[PDB]
Amino acid sequence: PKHEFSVDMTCGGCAEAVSRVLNKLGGVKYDIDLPNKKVCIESEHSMDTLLATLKKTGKTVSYLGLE
Amino acid sequence: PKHEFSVDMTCGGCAEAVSRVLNKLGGVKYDIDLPNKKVCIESEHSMDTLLATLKKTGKTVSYLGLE
Ligand SMILES: [Zn+2]
């Protein structure tokens, strides 16, 4: 499935941090849109797991839905 | 014990995210210095707990020392 998240990133270092935690999770194909504060993740991992992984960063995260 | 870490923060959002993962751990008093990319932490938590907590940001972290 393909999920979209809102993630409050401000600089390219913020985007790098999201990339690093998602790399560490594994089993994801992701695309980070820094100026629109959006992260799109294609994964077999549950929405819960993706959301928990993103919130681990200490950034503000919410769910923009499927597809 | 007062621990000192290097954390590669490059914007104020990077710094706030550090403060939220530390708030989540709890039992910490801290100072985050953005231009010098340093986080000082007074805590009874072990060095390894603090290090692991900071690494959840997805940022590059290293240990500077202890007082
Ligand atoms: Zn940043």
Author numbering:
A (entry chain B), B (entry chain A): 2 to 68
Tell me what the authors wrote about this structure, in their words.
For the first time, crystals of Zn-bound human Cu-chaperone Atox1 have been obtained and the structure solved by X-ray diffraction to a resolution of 1.9 Å. The crystals exhibit P65 symmetry and two protein molecules per asymmetric unit (hereinafter named chains A and B). The two chains are equally folded and arranged in a two-fold axis passing through the cage of the metal binding motif, similar to what was found in the previously solved dimeric structures. A positive Fo-Fc electron density signal was found between the two protein chains near the Cys12 and Cys15 residues, supporting the presence of a metal ion. Fortunately, it is possible to confirm the identity and location of a metal ion within a protein by collecting X-ray diffraction data at photon energies close to the metal absorption edge. In our case, a peak in the anomalous scattering density map close to the cysteine residues of the CXXC motifs was found at 9690 eV, an energy right above the Zn K-edge (9640 eV), while no anomalous signal was found close to the Cu K-edge (8970 eV), as shown in Figure 3c. Therefore, it is possible to conclude that the electron density found in between the CXXC metal binding motifs of the two chains belongs to a Zn ion. Zn binds to the sulfur atoms of Cys12 and Cys15 of the two chains in a tetrahedral arrangement, similarly to the Atox1 homodimers formed with other metal ions. The Zn ion presents a crystallographic occupancy of 0.69 and is surrounded by four cysteine residues (Cys12 and Cys15 of chains A and B). The sulfur atoms of the cysteines around the cage are at 2.3–2.4 Å from the metal center and arranged in a tetrahedral geometry, with bond angles ranging from 105° to 118°, as expected for a regular tetrahedral coordination environment. Moreover, although the affinity of Atox1 for Zn2+ is lower than that of EDTA, soaking of the Zn-loaded Atox1 crystals with 2 mM EDTA for 10 min resulted in only limited removal of the metal ion from the coordination cage.
Atox1 is a cytosolic small protein (68 amino acids) able to chelate Cu by a conserved surface-exposed Cys-X-X-Cys (CXXC) motif. Once bound to Atox1, Cu is delivered to cytoplasmic metal-binding domains of ATP7A and ATP7B (also called Menkes and Wilson disease proteins, respectively), two homologous multi-domain P1B-type ATPases located in the trans-Golgi network, for incorporation into Cu-dependent enzymes.
